Design a protein around this ligand. Structure first.
Ligand SMILES: Nc1ncnc2c1ncn2[C@@H]1O[C@H](COP(=O)(O)OP(=O)(O)O)[C@@H](O)[C@H]1O
Ligand SMILES: Nc1ncnc2c1ncn2[C@@H]1O[C@H](COP(=O)(O)OP(=O)(O)O)[C@@H](O)[C@H]1O
Lengths: 601, 588
């Protein structure tokens, strides 16, 4: 039933020769020269980092004064790019060993702490991506020491000749290939520097003008950072013009090394961009997610020494590692935002109004219940048990629940007045249960997807009203029996209503649970029905036979049957609208206007 | 104010010593084994590609040599010994080729094979190898690697290594024709001795390899690379299944474009538009090369506004990064993106002609991508290309039915200059804008733009057909004034202007002077026009002194009813309790 050819059959005959791996060096030069990096411009990053390492080796050994800097020059007329550092330089033996041997890194034999970038022994060859000729002039300290010129066309061979007039350090001239002349442009070179080499530890000069390198804030001690320094750094990393309303400066060492800053912009998010975020670093140079999708409103920077880098310094090398980093950051950001709620609830209300949509998206799109509930801790509602305007949370609702209660009741309505006076809340007031009031458009969807919180099932007031019909409906009316239609009158009214609304409602019943309102529409899965109307069901019309409008309808059906029918139709429509289950309300206006005149004689 | 230290001061004195570039072979094995790829699992992709190439070389030998011999790649896991084994029945390797091909970094037997083929030999486009390093990915995951190989000529051989500097070679019996590679997995890579883990990697990268792949005796890669076949020989059901696979979807493609071409690059591609519609509560076009996955999410081959497309792009000659997971920057790849943009745009315009019904549903669903594209590009010729897909409503024909900018440019007074538009919430608010009647005197036809972001789409557009887009932004004589003057006093906050106009069935309506101030009343300056013949307004005139409580309930309702008729209030829940009062008081 199976097809296999792999069998343990092989056996060694006789002896074995030992061999050493070799290398096809001409082809290796070519691989590094056109196949290693996806973007040609990174030769600038590679040569600058070598210059920084040379300056580090000099700074380290001179403890044990001279200037320590990196100079760039563009000559568009001669088509050349030049970088010179004032670092340790190289002697002749160093030039042929380090530049001559691919994968040889002097900067790795240097130990035996943390400023060095070099390791792979290949970065220098990236110049041959953009140059058909490379000259190096280098001068060691002290040491012997003559000056040397190293020269190569990049494919095969190089030459080393003694030289005079070589300044302490190293100068590299690239005679640019004809299709790489952009790198003889000052603006072009400047933009590559600030992209990749913007936090280098030594001054960089481009054509005699010093460049505005920055401090790597994320690596520094958090209360050595003023608010003003965060405003400026935020504007740089977010390329923004405003300022951050929150700043989270997050360092960790276990389980992962993490050095990170996150900002929430003062600006409200663009709605065009929400439907249309953080830079990743190591050793202060860039890597080409890190955050769950719902936290993409965050700006800032993340740096982690546990992210291994591929040879090219643009791929990150362990995806499960990245899910772990993502999950650590997500929990830390949730903890931060909860803390902001405690510190300053009014400012958090503003933040929740501007960014809450991201919390809702996060809850709806996660599959992990514990993650859903963690994000849900950020949500804010009002409550029937609190004064109007006062914001509360799911956890505060949980803590007020009596020892016996098993469910969290909520009511979705456009504003505080409507929830407080909803027919659905009037029905719930008969019970002894707090009711969360939720005013935002996608609140109900969110709670439906959340489903439970702290092992307590979420139940909307509308749903709960229907489930009571199938329990011991032990509810008493708000007006005494004198003030309601008699049973004979109700049943006569209901039989008339069923005939007049025959192809619209599944059933029509009297309810003891309304006071202000004449009627309500009920649907077991009310929240799902509201959402499904996102461009016919089994709705029940429940009537308050103590309401003056219902009592009048019962009279109109015999005193003016046609006026009663227009009125019945409008009561149904009003209840549908109150239920949030109404289609386009415009065609109702004619009947209402026709009803209004007829009612007003 | 300058400070530059770069000066022409060096002069060569002495002679040249000429040297050859070399390589530090041990550290290079470490790099090419561990620091190349973004995932350890790629070693399976690499060894399967090598096996495929071995099989392709054997098939090519048999055109002239005509040997036989099943052509298969077999994988075997062993979770007790912690090993992963791959065996192919291809050309194998004699002792010379083992030492040369395995023993030398960057040495590629398959590249030399390719370089010696006739131009149009079928194997020229199927051989994956190139860089000479892929095999070393085994040492990412393996403490020890053993290769048993038998060539198709004349003795079997065993190549062995721990990855550090050196390897051994010995004669071996009894090796089957071809090559068997045994990986002794590192402890922290034991997962690749799990059958289910290996299956995941095979399907991820190697699902379309041209030769049957078996795992522990059972066949895997059952999918065929539709994008390589003749567009005619593919039926609609095959596209539906391939779409569902490649997009990880459960619906159907509403549109299918199967595009093949040969310059600027060899391209074999299928693009699909889903039938279902995106929501904020939530793949991409994959890039392939020679039937191997390069990127599940192809980055730079399509403009970002075409990211709603799903499907596959395969190129035999696209310049690949050493990792085989990225493209090198390339004028050819920039030119391909421009080519694909034009091709897709043309396919969509054709669909609009073949089926305006279908295309209208499509624009409703995906027009945000067309608008985003016109906004975010910086080339005017492209903006007018994407704009050919835009649809709007127009004054010149009724609701629901749509027209293109080319259709508008068609019907214009002989020698008309500008294209005229008005971005508004809806048709009713547009037909009553103080700025619409003015242009109903000049250039009669004006485009009505109800959609979100229509405004900045046309502003960022700025010029289509080299023509400029530009916006623009009964009852007695005076017993009506008695009622009209009484009205502002009871609505001092909301409306400001309350006129009187001839409406028929409606007592009042709402009009707005600027759709900019009305479009974000919906996230106000309303005018309340009134017909004095309506029986609710002659009624309102009466009760204001009769039943003044009833007369304001009636007033709020006429206002709210008018706001609903104008689409400025679409959720009337706040009125309902009051309306119920009005109704209860009107009925006595
Ligand atoms: N500007 C420089 N000044 C001094 N030494 C340098 C310079 N650039 C390169 N080197 C030496 O040459 C070596 C080879 O560099 P490279 O091939 O780029 O690999 P890596 O940067 O990983 O060391 C470096 O390790 C360093 O020892
Ligand atoms: N399974 C195999 N059967 C026969 N030859 C192989 C096999 N695997 C590798 N080779 C040979 O060894 C060479 C080196 O393989 P590799 O280092 O992966 O580089 P590439 O595939 O880019 O050539 C290949 O070109 C091919 O000649």
């Amino acid at each position: 039933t199976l097809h296999n050819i792999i069998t343990d059959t092989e056996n060694v005959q006789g002896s074995f020769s030992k061999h050493e791996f070799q290398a096809e060096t001409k082809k290796l030069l070519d691989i590094v020269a056109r196949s290693l990096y996806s973007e040609k411009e990174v030769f600038i990053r590679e040569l600058i980092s070598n210059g920084s390492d040379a300056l580090e080796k000099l700074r380290h050994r001179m403890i044990t004064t001279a200037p320590m800097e990196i100079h760039l020059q563009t000559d568009s007329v001669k088509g050349t790019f030049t970088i010179q550092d004032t670092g340790v330089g190289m002697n002749k033996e160093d030039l042929v060993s380090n530049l001559g041997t691919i994968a040889r890194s002097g900067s790795k034999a240097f130990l035996d702490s943390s400023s060095i970038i070099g390791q792979f022994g290949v970065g220098f060859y990236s110049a041959f991506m953009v140059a058909d000729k490379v000259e190096v002039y280098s001068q060691s300290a002290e040491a012997d020491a003559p000056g040397y010129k190293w020269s190569s066309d990049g494919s095969g061979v190089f030459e080393v000749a003694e030289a005079s007039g070589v300044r302490q350090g190293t100068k590299i001239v690239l005679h640019l290939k004809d299709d790489c002349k952009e790198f003889s442009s000052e603006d072009r070179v400047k933009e590559v520097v600030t992209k990749y080499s913007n936090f280098v530890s030594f001054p960089i000069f481009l054509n005699g003008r010093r460049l505005n390198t920055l401090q790597a804030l994320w690596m520094m001690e958090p209360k050595d950072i003023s608010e003003w320094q965060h405003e400026e750094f935020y504007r740089y990393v977010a390329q923004a013009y405003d300022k951050p309303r929150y700043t989270l400066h997050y360092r960790a060492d276990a389980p992962l090394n993490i050095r990170s800053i996150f900002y929430v912009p003062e600006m409200k998010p663009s709605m065009f961009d929400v439907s249309r975020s953080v830079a990743l670093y190591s050793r202060k140079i860039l890597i080409q997610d890190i955050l769950p999708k719902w936290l993409r409103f965050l700006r800032g920077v993340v740096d982690s020494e546990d992210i291994p880098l591929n040879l090219s310094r643009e791929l990150l090398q362990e995806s499960a590692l990245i899910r772990k980093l993502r999950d650590v950051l997500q929990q830390r950001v949730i903890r931060f935002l909860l803390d902001q709620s405690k510190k300053d609830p009014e400012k958090y209300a503003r933040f929740f109004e501007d960014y809450g949509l991201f919390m809702r998206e996060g809850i709806v799109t996660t599959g992990e219940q514990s993650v859903k509930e963690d994000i849900a801790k950020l949500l804010r509602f009002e409550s029937s048990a609190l004064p109007a305007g006062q914001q509360t949370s799911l956890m505060e609702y949980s803590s007020r629940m009596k020892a016996g209660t098993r469910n969290i009741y909520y009511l979705c309505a456009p504003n505080r007045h409507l929830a407080e006076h909803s027919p659905y809340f009037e029905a719930m007031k008969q019970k002894d249960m707090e009711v969360l009031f939720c005013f935002e458009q996608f609140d109900e969807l969110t709670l439906l997807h959340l489903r439970e919180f702290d092992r307590k099932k979420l139940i909307s007031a509308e749903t709960d009203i229907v489930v009571d019909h199938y329990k011991e409906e032990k509810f008493q009316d708000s007006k005494p029996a004198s003030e309601r239609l008699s049973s004979e009158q109700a049943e006569d009214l209901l039989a008339w209503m069923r005939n007049a609304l025959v192809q619209r409602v599944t059933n029509i019943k009297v309810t003891p649970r309304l006071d202000t309102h004449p009627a309500m529409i009920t649907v077991l899965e009310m929240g799902a029905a509201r959402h499904f109307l996102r461009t016919i069901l089994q709705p029940t019309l429940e009537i308050n036979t103590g309401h003056d409008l219902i009592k009048k309808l019962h009279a109109l059906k015999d005193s003016n049957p046609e006026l009663a029918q227009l009125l019945l139709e409008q009561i149904y429509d009003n209840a549908m609208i109150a239920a949030g289950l109404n289609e386009d309300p415009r065609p109702m206006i004619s009947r209402l206007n026709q009803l209004l005149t007829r009612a007003l004689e």
